[PDB]
């Protein structure tokens with residue numbers, strides 16, 4: 001089919017950008033969890049901001065993320081869904097996950113099982 | 129504060145070796161500039177464009193601030209900077225500014241021709257433009273080109289020590305300097321003493337009188353040594369140590385540590401500056417509410 | 422009969438007549454994250470002013486007694502107050518460990534490379550940093566340390582504590598010098614201290630991820646030589 005070339009020289013600028021993205025995601029998640037465990041929604045427009053800036057960096061470097069991150073974050077307001085509104089299933093569709101802002105992220109789960117994403121398949125992925 | 133940024137080094141080519149008599153003479157003229165009074169000295173070194181630049185890292189600079197001038201500093205109480213004036217006449221194959229610039233502190237130029245003067249102001253990242261005051265001006269200095277170069281950065285530099293060399297050179301010196309002051313619109317004028325000996329040194333009030341008799345005003349002369357002199361030092365000092373005037377490895381203390389003033393407290397090995405734990409995030413609030421410092 | 426006609430050339434013509442004359446609830450907040458962030462940083466300042474008023478009404482200078490006083494007598498006012506004691510470990514440890522991982526700062530310090538480290542700091546984000554105003558055009562801005570909650574274009578947002586003050590502090594960047602310490606894991610032997618200037622970069626962090634910074638005229642930096 002073609003040529004099989006596997007390079008492990010990772011580039012320094014891509015490592016800098018992904019460390020920046022991962023640091024923003026970690027600080028937003030830790031703000032959200034440290035606020036959520038203790039008391040009510042104090043600075044929930046704050047951490048979301050980081051995620052939004054994170055996604056804007058994903059516009060600049062043109063990089064892609066795993067569907068775990070994009071499944072965690074929202075699409076319109078770009079907030080973390082670690083505490084969502086409601087989860088409904090088999091309500092004449094497949095699945096529905098409601099949020100506080102009203103934007104839902106649903107999944108076709110009632111069609112068939114054993115469907116995996118392209119990054120979750122057996123051999124398509126090499127860690128580190 | 130006073131800056132004298134054109135003291136020459138007694139060497140022109142890398143094949144030549146400086147004798148100890150010239151080094152002792154430079155020690156005596158630095159003691160001379162410390163005797164009456166000055167604040168900053170940036171010693172200059174000359175290379176040509178058609179020479180063979182060495183492919184080294186720690187051998188590009190025969191300046192040695194650490195071993196000999198570090199011993200002179202403790203009895204002196206001043207500082208030295210190392211700088212290069214680029215003698216460029218034709219666009220030849222020689223281009224190694226990424227090493228010669230980052231090795232030294234201030235990058236200057238000495239153009240002789242027409243196109244070189246244009247490509248120096250246009251593309252070459254330097255700090256100062258020095259002209260050959262000993263010889264003739266190349267063709268003409270235009271107003272809008274030099275004005276846009278000053279608005280871009282780089283200022284013009286007048287060497288009042290070159291008139292103290294010979295008798296015939298004074299006429300060409302004044303004929304160059306009046307044209308420089310006229311075409312520069314009195315914005316980018318930095319003055320320096322090109323003396324190879326302590327026997328040609330002057331005081332501030334005599335250099336001010338020289339600048340008066342050349343055609344530039346007096347308040348603008350002292351402003352050129354206070355404002356314009358120490359800013360073009362900081363330009364090259366931030367360009368070569370730090371990023372392109374973006375993020376600096378220099379400690380911002382109250383009145384003792386500065387990128388210009390605290391040279392010895394910065395490790396000049398690569399970049400770094402070893403600073404003790406003066407910032408504690410635990411129990412330090414507003415500055416006026418502290419009690420331990 | 423003079424050429425300088427004041428009333429004629431401006432007030433009475435048809436071209437300069439336009440010139441002044443010579444005789445003369447939860448969903449609506451988080452629709453935009455920026456506007457909700459603005460409402461939050463306004464609400465924190467208003468709650469800090471109300472906290473100062475209730476602190477003068479309390480007449481107790483201790484802040485640990487003041488927080489319990491607000492918890493006892495003002496429940497709804499206490500809900501929007503910041504917690505700096507919580508803010509320090511949740512930010513400083515992550516920031517220091519991220520810089521120790523990113524800039525390759527390890528136990529071996531003799532293999533360091535400064536230019537690539539400054540390039541990484543030009544590529545790294547400052548969201549969550551402890552930063553100190555060391556020099557400024559204003560004499561009152563200096564001496565302020567604080568941790569970033571958000572990066573703006575030309576201003577800077579930190580938080581600092583006083584005796585009883587817990588106000589969100591906005592500081593201009595045009596004409597200020599900032600510094601931050603990078604500690605090393607050894608105790609009291611060696612540590613690093615870097616500096617930035619907020620007047621030099623005047624863009625968003627989104628643009629800062631892509632922009633390659635170039636030289637400037639740098640004429641307005643005389644204050645850094647002055648003070």
Ligand SMILES: [Zn+2]
Pocket residue numbers: 074075077078079099100101102103
């Ligand atoms: Zn949502």
